[PDB]
């Protein structure tokens, strides 16, 4: 609810101007448990009051923050605004103290005011701060106007022994060493309170954030009967985090999690019988975040009746998105059906399996199919991956005479086993049916059956025209992953290395080889949400590989600022550096600079006129700005690069559309 007016009461002398400057709950603000929690912490830390009962009141359909203050007596020396700023006896001399010097100096006659015993209640509070008393009873003997104000006090006996029971994790000697109110000193109520706070803090530091105190008593014999309860997870349950789901109720379908129970169970690191090591919880939440299908996870401790140490820890889980269907179609003269539709389902069947159908079409005779299935972990297995993806690509390249049209049918399969949570070894095979087509009207075949190309009025024999051939290949690859999140990684390392060697038919039937190394890393940049990202792609291939399967450099995937396939060859190395900035939750500003070039083509098609030797030379460079906006309907990318340095191509702006 919003706020209509902040009407503060009881703030009779503590400045309304000062508090309204300090308080951030102005009119029209938002009401949230975290918001008022932070506000309560802020005003408590400010020190403009000792005790506050800030009760928000509903008013005019909004919230009226009513703050009930109990100000201290030691901030008036600021002199830049300030708080709350005939009697003859105080009577009842004490035993341990004289309660005349102490009172009349620290508390009485300055804060005692000789009457109005609210600051005298504060006086007994500071006596508990010195702890030298236990209970103070102000009995005002007002006679004929004058008052005696007898202050019947109870004095704390010195502690004879300090006994800790049920610690069971931290040795009692260290606990006693941390203790401030040692035996032989007077029992001290507020020092006892701060000592318990420090004990809790020490337990927090040693890795146990779920320990309470229960009892902190001292009997008449001056025996500080200290009690500490550890808190041992007896049962850990998982239910979805029911946040402010506007427009939705707590229906049985809403609160149930589509993801199966075993997926969450195999990821939890907290184990029963252990005292809630917060590092274990941090590891569990890190794993759950790295799973990708979640956005936020919180824990909650609930007591089990009849079991003091028992804690029924319950995990809260947020689901982001399982099914998606995004598509965009442009048509009508000029180009063709420029359709880019997807059916990504990255929680298909609730088993974390990624399942998706992708269709793409463009003006440059591009057609794409992809039925990708991937299981990062088979149900009840020892971390063994699985998946298969069938793809068809009717790629067209009008700039190549011999390879005007390229058809592809592929059915790949990859299975992998993980040597830990960061090393992944996998073997993946595929089968391809490729049909190559030449440019009609540019290649002439004579009656002998051979093909000739006319350059400066002479015929050159060109072979491999209209090539149709199968293509079988396998590759064992190892990958190293440390990214925190797959969708929007912020810090980590990602190295992939595959060695490919397969058999191909058609022209020059034989067995070809291939290798590829790709490194991706991230680290923190200039400021908040500024992430520096580095990607270097490397790969070599034997000359026996088919021309269509040779490495391509260009486009929005590898090298911006140049057309697709600007560089071709059997040796490719592309390095890219990006600076992504997350200004909000729906847009992202990215500045990128990339460089790379393929080498050693030695191909038949004379279309490639930039065949350059000397690996590591003539490396084209590009840079530009990019927009990575997180639309409510799905991720989307925009890229604009300027070809800089050596300007082999005279083109300027470049546009790219992708997810």
């Amino acid at each position, epitope marked *: *609810l919003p706020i209509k007016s902040v009407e503060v009461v009881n703030n009779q002398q503590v400045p309304a101007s000062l508090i309204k400057n300090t308080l951030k709950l102005k009119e029209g603000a938002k*009401f949230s*448990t975290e918001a008022l929690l932070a506000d309560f912490n802020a005003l408590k830390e400010t020190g403009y009051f000792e005790d506050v*009962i*800030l*009760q*928000p*009141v*509903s008013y005019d359909g909004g*919230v009226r923050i009513v703050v009930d203050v109990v100000e201290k007596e030691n901030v008036v020396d600021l002199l830049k605004e300030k708080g709350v700023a005939v009697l003859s006896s105080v009577k009842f001399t004490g035993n341990k103290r004289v309660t005349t010097s102490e009172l009349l100096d620290i508390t009485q006659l300055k804060a005692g005011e000789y009457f109005s015993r609210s600051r005298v209640e504060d006086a007994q509070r500071r006596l508990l701060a010195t702890g030298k008393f236990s*209970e103070v009873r102000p009995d005002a003997q007002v006679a004929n106007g004058k008052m005696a104000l007898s202050f019947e006090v109870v004095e704390n006996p010195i502690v004879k022994s300090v006994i800790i029971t049920g610690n069971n994790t931290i040795p009692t000697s260290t606990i006693m060493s941390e203790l401030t109110t040692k035996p032989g000193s007077v029992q001290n109520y507020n020092n006892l309170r701060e000592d318990r706070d420090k004990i809790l803090g020490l337990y927090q530091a040693q890795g146990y954030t*779920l320990v*309470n*105190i*229960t*009892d*902190m*008593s*001292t*009997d*008449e014999n001056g025996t500080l009967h200290i*009690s500490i309860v550890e*808190g041992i997870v007896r049962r850990i349950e998982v239910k979805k985090m029911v946040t402010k789901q506007k427009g939705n109720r707590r229906t049985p379908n809403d609160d149930v999690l589509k993801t199966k129970d075993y997926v969450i169970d195999r990821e939890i690191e907290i184990q029963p019988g252990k005292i809630f090591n917060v590092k274990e919880y941090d590891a569990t939440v890190d794993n759950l975040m790295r799973l990708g299908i979640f956005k936020n996870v919180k824990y*909650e*401790a*609930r*007591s*089990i*009746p009849g079991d003091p140490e*028992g*804690i*029924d820890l319950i995990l809260l889980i947020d689901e982001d998105r399982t099914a998606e269907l995004q598509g965009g179609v442009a048509y009508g003269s000029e180009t063709g059906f420029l359709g880019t539709l997807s059916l990504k389902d990255s929680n298909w069947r609730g088993k974390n399996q990624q399942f998706g159908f992708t269709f793409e079409k463009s003006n440059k005779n591009y057609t794409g199919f992809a039925l990708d299935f991937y299981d990062p972990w088979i149900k009840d297995t020892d971390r063994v991956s699985w998946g298969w993806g069938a793809y068809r690509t009717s790629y067209g390249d009008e700039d190549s005479i011999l390879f005007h049209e390229i058809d592809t049918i592929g059915f790949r399969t990859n299975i992998g086993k993980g040597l830990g949570k960061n090393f992944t070894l996998s073997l993946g095979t595929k089968v391809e049916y490729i049909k190559e087509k030449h440019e009609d009207g540019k290649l002439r075949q004579a009656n002998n059956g051979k093909w000739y190309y006319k350059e400066k009025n002479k015929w050159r024999e060109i072979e491999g025209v209209d090539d149709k051939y199968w293509l079988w290949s396998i590759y064992p690859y190892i990958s190293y992953d440390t990214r925190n999140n797959y969708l929007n990684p912020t810090s980590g390392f990602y190295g992939k290395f595959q060695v490919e060697a397969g058999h191909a038919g058609g022209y020059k039937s034989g067995n070809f080889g291939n290798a590829t190394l790709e490194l991706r890393t991230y680290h923190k940049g200039l400021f908040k949400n500024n992430i520096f990202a580095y990607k270097v792609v490397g790969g070599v291939a034997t000359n026996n590989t088919k021309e269509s399967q040779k490495f391509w450099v260009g486009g929005g995937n590898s090298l911006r600022g140049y057309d697709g396939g600007f560089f071709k060859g059997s040796q490719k190395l592309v390095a890219t550096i990006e600076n992504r900035t997350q200004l909000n939750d729906i847009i992202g500003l990215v500045v990128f600079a990339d460089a790379g070039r393929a080498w050693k083509q030695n191909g038949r098609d004379p279309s490639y006129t930039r065949d350059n030797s000397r690996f590591g030379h003539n490396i084209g460079t590009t840079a530009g700005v990019g927009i990575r906006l997180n639309t409510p309907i799905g991720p989307l990318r925009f890229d604009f690069g300027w070809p800089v340095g050596n300007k082999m191509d005279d083109d300027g702006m470049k546009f790219y559309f992708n997810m």
Partner: antibody
Amino acid sequence: EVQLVESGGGLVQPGGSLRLSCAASGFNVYSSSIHWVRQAPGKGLEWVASIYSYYGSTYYADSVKGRFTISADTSKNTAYLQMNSLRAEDTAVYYCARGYSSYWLKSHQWPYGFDYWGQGTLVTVSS
Amino acid sequence: QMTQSPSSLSASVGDRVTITCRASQSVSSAVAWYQQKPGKAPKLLIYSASSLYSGVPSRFSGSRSGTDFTLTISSLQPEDFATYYCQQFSQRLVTFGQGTKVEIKR
């Protein structure tokens, strides 16, 4: 095994005084809340006072702003409610009830409901 | 604030009964009502929208309807005919409802 027993009740005249005691039997008052409620005969229940230990907050509901005091010491694991200047409506039973927040971490002292209720004591103010 | 409820209600064994409880507070308001047996002492049976873990025969349940809180008790039982209260928790202000009585209809 947790239960509470009330004692110190008795018979007084208007303007009199008393001291009501509630003793814990298995939990420690240093962490629990101990709430006092009363039920006038043939009428509903009405909150009186509550002393949250572990926080040192002791404020009384409506009719006890200056009349009675509730003080609890953990030495004898009991809570003491003072009585003075009692009036006609004070003739009722008195229940001491522990308040329990569903969270195990005992830094969350919000009441969230009273479960363990004592036996009750009858106090009559009639002259 | 007053948290008024309908004082007199009559039902029968096996019937489904409801009891509204008006209120006026913020979002952080939580209610908890007790089946006060007419002789000994009240007993908690709901926290804010969920029942107490130990004592409930899976009958008493309820939720919040705006500023009104209701109970959906299952088929009535001979031992459940008692006085049922209502309460709401603001920032250190325990308010109790006027209370309702449940008895047979004949």
